[PDB]
């Protein structure tokens, strides 16, 4: 089951009009002052004003 | 699924070797063709 015509630029790009990205769930610790994911331990091991690791 | 090349160095050298080619008239002219073409091996 193949195409009978190659697809154009336009329809190729309209297909991929949906596959753009997001990850905006960042936040800053009040204690240390660094960015980390929401609800996640910091890359320097802090979580809600406390070192955990 | 057994394949068609089953290697043996003795059967190699006795069918296609140097002395087998130089035993017969036609193998001597195999070597002279294959030497006239300029080949590096000439006994395979």
């Amino acid at each position: 089951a193949v195409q009978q015509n190659k697809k154009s630029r336009s329809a190729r790009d309209m297909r991929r009009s949906h596959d753009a990205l997001e990850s905006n769930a960042l936040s800053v610790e009040k204690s240390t002052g660094e960015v980390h994911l929401r609800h996640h331990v910091s890359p320097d091991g802090f979580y809600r004003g406390r070192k955990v690791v | 699924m057994k394949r068609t090349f089953q290697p043996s160095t003795l059967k190699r050298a006795r069918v296609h070797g140097f002395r087998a080619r130089m035993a017969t008239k036609n193998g001597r002219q195999v070597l002279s063709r294959r030497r006239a073409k300029g080949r590096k091996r000439l006994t395979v």
Binding site: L37, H39, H40, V41, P43, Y47, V52, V53 | -
Partner: protein, 118 residues
């Protein structure tokens, strides 16, 4: 359709789950903090916490009911002597789960699972 159906398959047989979960229980009772995937952390808390609740009471029946489902002598000794006298006045929730980024090779969402008074 899994309406109201607990437990998760984790791409495994049931015996594989049982081995992996009592391994993680034993490893958490020795180290008190391990590092694992977030769904295996969500399913460890249903295996590992009844063992501590069982360990809050010293009986021979309790220590070989612990032993047949955490089958290592060292974790039955770590329970009933350390974890179970510590957690004797806490009504559940003996371990917490803290999400910690993603694994580098996959994107497996990672979590730390930690005994609460460590």
């Amino acid at each position: 359709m899994r309406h109201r159906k607990s437990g998760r398959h984790l791409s495994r047989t049931s015996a594989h789950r049982k081995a992996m979960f009592q391994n993680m229980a034993v490893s958490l009772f020795e180290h008190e903090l391990i590092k694992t995937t977030l769904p295996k952390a969500k399913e460890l808390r249903r295996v590992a916490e009844p063992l501590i609740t069982l360990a809050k009471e010293d009986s021979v029946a309790n220590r070989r009911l612990a032993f047949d489902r955490t089958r290592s002598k060292a974790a039955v000794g770590k329970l009933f002597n350390d974890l179970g006298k510590r957690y004797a006045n806490r009504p559940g929730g003996y371990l917490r789960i803290l999400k910690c980024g993603f694994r580098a090779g996959d994107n497996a969402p990672m979590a730390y699972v930690e005994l609460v008074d460590r």
